[PDB]
């Protein structure tokens, strides 16, 4: 027992991290087979950052302009192209540590592990969620661009996120691995506001189940509600509406705890309108929303990955 | 910017994990060079669990009684011995994925990453701390014993923790890699109470600095205090005394933020006597105590590991 913000083990991803240097810019890249993926704003210069034309800037460049370190092994660029906001550097050596992988686009509310990297070297791993406003609340410093977010399915790494930029509120923005931003952001140093965030209701419910599974249960009750009446309350407190689809994903946890989903909704409703009143749940004093139902089941039942 | 409970990248450790099966008991082992380390209670049986005499139980086992899975490669035990509460299984193949490593014993307050494993397969990685009562608040299921905790030092894995057992309050107890338990615990299915836990003061302060470094300043004040008067208040709030040594480790953070250590102590005192009044720090509504000063410096300046 216990419950922790758990990341996927990061070994298959560390094997894919390289350094990409172009002009004065150094960021990380993801080396899979003979392709190195990285943010196209690597091609920018300090005065290019404002409103660049990347098509102009990219055609402006040669294969030799891209320095790619795989440690002390320098990879030679034999071609390059741009797919949306990612640059694809074709190199003459296929990464012998390439795992089975996919490129997936995740939906808001879903979680993933991030291997924060600098200079091609992994610095740490942590769990995040795709916020409803398509930002992520991560920990990224200058140099961390090219860092990736991923889930693992048994033996397959599902890449879902690459880091690009930090918004003024301290949150972060990036792309899937096909280069399309999550949310309405663009890779330009121009004022862009994240949009109002909201709490991922289905994830709070999942975390309340993890609590019960772990013996926290001061918060339950005899009351029930209907989806409709609960969602009137979710609007008031800035929460994602709960769908019947969401109720359906919460089935397994509901059946394991023997607490109906709409009963745990009543519980969340009382927590929302009365607060926690000095007590904690799973060591937190806030309603935690960065655990999916999958996350809870996996951790509270010991799924492993090969 | 941003601040997350960040684990070390776990690749070097994943390459050392094996499955150890003896009798009806399966758990994880750590395979370094030609030695496989695992909890000695692997040699227990369901009725041996009570007050066993492991010296008796061990001399009475044979090398062939130990199944060691390195994935689908079965390792042959060629010798075994017991160092305190770990079993050291000598095998005829040295792990080709052995990293530079050290066995360290950590002090209370220090942190480490845990690679939670089942059947020799990594399930997830998370950060923990050695609580002042020598438990850890981990996430551990049946089959997880033999999972290790570790820090990384540029290229060197400092192993510090091997999981053995869960205490009734849901927390976890274990040994260093030399087999000596942390705290007054023994590997016996008998009533043992963890003892009263206390908050790690030096770590709370360091996290308050992380907050400032990240722009959470809503808790600062003009007041100062002396170590004496502050410790008088740590006393009252079940906080760990602050030493002049502790004040000295916090120097670099103090210098980088321009907030004297005893000014930050005045801030913590006010947070303790008055609560946070519905506000959060670094996205927590509690005072967080599982970031060392070194964790904050690592994360707020991007230390990498090769
Ligand atoms: C890449 O390593 C780096 C990662 C950032 C740096 C600090 N924390 C991070 O996560 N990303 C950038 O420096 C990025 C370069 C770039 C060029 C074109 C698009 O991105 N720029 C940023 O992240 C900017 N953010 C930004 O432009 O946000 C909008 C904005 C608001 C106000 C005024 C101007 C722009 C930050 C470095 C500010
Ligand atoms: C090893 O995989 C397993 C991991 C545990 C199980 C669930 N979560 C974990 O972290 N460890 C054990 O099952 C361990 C075996 C053992 C043999 C000799 C010493 O330990 N036993 C436990 O963890 C016990 N805990 C325990 O004995 O605590 C004291 C106690 C309190 C009340 C009553 C009896 C004993 C649990 C399985 C109860």
Q: Are strands B25-32 and B67-70 parallel, antiparallel or unpaired?
A: unpaired
Using an 8 Å Cβ cutoff, are B245 and B286 in contact? Answer: no
Is there a common fold for B11-91 and B201-300?
no
Pairing status of strand A101-103 against strand A156-166: parallel
Tell me which residue of B117, B110, B156, B127 sits closest to B7, measured CA to CA: B127
Q: How far apart are CA A141 and CA A224, in angstroms?
A: 45
Q: Using CA atoms, how far apart are residues B104 and B127, in angstroms rounded to an integer?
A: 17
Instruction: Tell me which residues of chain B, numbers 180 to 199, contact chain A at a CB-CB cutoff of 8 Å.
Output: none
**What does residue A118 show for φ and ψ, rounded to 5 degrees?**
-140, 135
- Quick check: B227 and B233 in contact, CB under 8 A? no
What is the fold of B11-91? Thrombin, subunit H (2.40.10)
Q: How far apart are CA A131 and CA A116, in angstroms?
A: 18
Which of B43, B116, B165, B174 for mutating ligand 2's site (highest number of atoms within 8 Å of CB)? B165
Encoded tokens for B189: 């299915």
State how far the Cα of B123 lies from the Cα of A169, in Å rounded to an integer: 33
Please state, in angstroms and rounded to a whole number, the distance separating the CA atoms of residues A165 and A181. Answer: 11
Q: What's the CATH class of domain B201-300?
A: mainly alpha
- B291 contact residues in A (CB cutoff 8 A): none
B232 with B170: CB under 8 angstroms? no
Q: Are B10 and A9 inside 8 Å of each other by CB?
A: yes
3-state secondary structure of B8: coil
Contact B133, B198 (CB under 8 A): yes
Cβ-Cβ contacts under 8 Å, B303 against chain A: 123
**Residues B157, B13 contacting (CB under 8 angstroms):** yes
- Closest CB to B9: pick one of A4, A124, A140: A124
Please give the interface size between A and B, counted as residue pairs whose CB atoms are below 8 Å apart: 165
Residues of A (202-241) whose Cβ lies below 8 Å from B: 214-215
Q: Is A86 buried (19+), middle (13-18) or exposed (0-12) by CB count in 10 A?
A: buried
- Rounded Cα gap, residues B41 and B179, in angstroms: 11
Q: Which atom of ligand 1 is nearest to the CA of A186?
A: 19
Instruction: Give the whole-angstrom CA distance, residue A144 versus residue B213.
Output: 18
Counting from 1 in the atom list of ligand 2, the atom nearest the Cα of B165 is: 23
Q: Does A290 touch chain B (CB under 8 A)?
A: no
Resolution given for this structure, in angstroms: 1.9
3-class secondary-structure state, position B252: helix
Contact B299 A215 (CB under 8 A): no
Among B165, B214, B302, the residue to mutate for chain A (most A Cβ within 10 A): B302
Q: How far apart are CA A129 and CA A5, in angstroms?
A: 11
* Contact yes or no for B57/B48 (Cβ under 8 A): yes
Determine whether the shortest distance from the Cβ of B131 to ligand 2 is under 6 A.
no
Whose tokens are 């749940």? That residue is: A281
CA B202 to CA A255: how far, in whole Å? 43
d(CA B50, CA B44): 9
Counting ligands in written order, which one lies closest to the CA of residue A214?
Answer: 2
Q: How far is B115 from chain A (nearest CA, A)?
A: 7
Q: Which residue of A has its CA nearest to B277?
A: A278
């Amino acid at each position: 027992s216990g419950f922790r913000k758990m990341a996927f083990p990061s070994g298959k991803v560390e094997g894919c991290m390289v350094q990409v240097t172009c002009g004065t810019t150094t960021l990380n890249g993801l080396w899979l087979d003979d392709v190195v993926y990285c943010p196209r704003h690597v091609i920018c210069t300090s005065e290019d950052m404002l409103n660049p034309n990347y098509e102009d800037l990219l055609i402006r460049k040669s294969n030799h302009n891209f320095l790619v370190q795989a440690g002390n092994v320098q990879l030679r660029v034999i071609g390059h192209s741009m797919q949306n906001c990612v640059l694809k550097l074709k190199v003459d050596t296929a990464n012998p540590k390439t795992p089975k992988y996919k490129f997936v686009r995740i939906q808001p509310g879903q979680t993933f592990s991030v291997l924060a990297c600098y200079n091609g070297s992994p610095s740490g791993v942590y769990q995040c969620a795709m916020r409803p406003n398509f930002t992520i609340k991560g920990s990224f410093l200058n140099g961390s661009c090219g860092s990736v977010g991923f889930n693992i399915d048994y033996d397959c790494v599902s890449f879902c996120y690459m880091h690009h930029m930090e918004l003024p509120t301290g949150v972060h923005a990036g792309t899937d691995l096909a280069g399309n931003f999550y949310g309405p952001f663009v890779d330009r140093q121009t004022a862009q506001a994240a949009g109002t965030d909201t709490t991922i209701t289905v994830n709070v419910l999942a975390w309340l189940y993890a609590a019960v599974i772990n013996g926290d249960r001061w918060f339950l009750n005899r009351f029930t509600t209907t989806l409709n009446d609960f969602n009137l309350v979710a609007m008031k407190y800035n929460y994602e509406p709960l769908t019947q689809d969401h109720v359906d994903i919460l089935g397994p946890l509901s059946a394991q705890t023997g607490i109906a989903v709409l009963d745990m909704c009543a519980s969340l409703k009382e927590l929302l309108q009365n607060g926690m009143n000095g007590r904690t749940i799973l060591g937190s004093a806030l309603l935690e929303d960065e655990f999916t139902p999958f996350d809870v089941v996996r951790q509270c039942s010991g799924v492993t990955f090969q």
